[PDB]
Amino acid sequence: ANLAAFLTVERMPIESAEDLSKQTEIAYGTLDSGSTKEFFRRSKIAV
Amino acid sequence: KPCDTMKVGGNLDSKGYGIATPKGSSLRTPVNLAVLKLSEQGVLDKLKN
Lengths: 47, 49
Prior knowledge:
The structure is cut from a larger assembly and holds two copies of chain A.
Chain A: H1 2-11, H2 17-21, H3 35-42
PDB class: membrane protein
Keywords: ampar, ion channels, neurotransmission, membrane protein
Chains A, B: Glutamate receptor
């Protein structure tokens, strides 16, 4: 039963910006001067 | 303690707490200016910390 569980689950730690936003163990940043930094400084998107 | 709860996910909205006075209160202007003074001098960040 557990071998079947292993194979079935295998058949179907950051994956997104939402992931970065919800945590703080992993630090994250951008180029100190760039269009990336400006994208974030002006984003109206909550995340 | 006992450190058994946890905040999960981002905030559902964005808003603020304000000092409230009766509509038309004489204290409205001084208390609005004081909150901005306490904001600008860093008092509100120190008190939350």
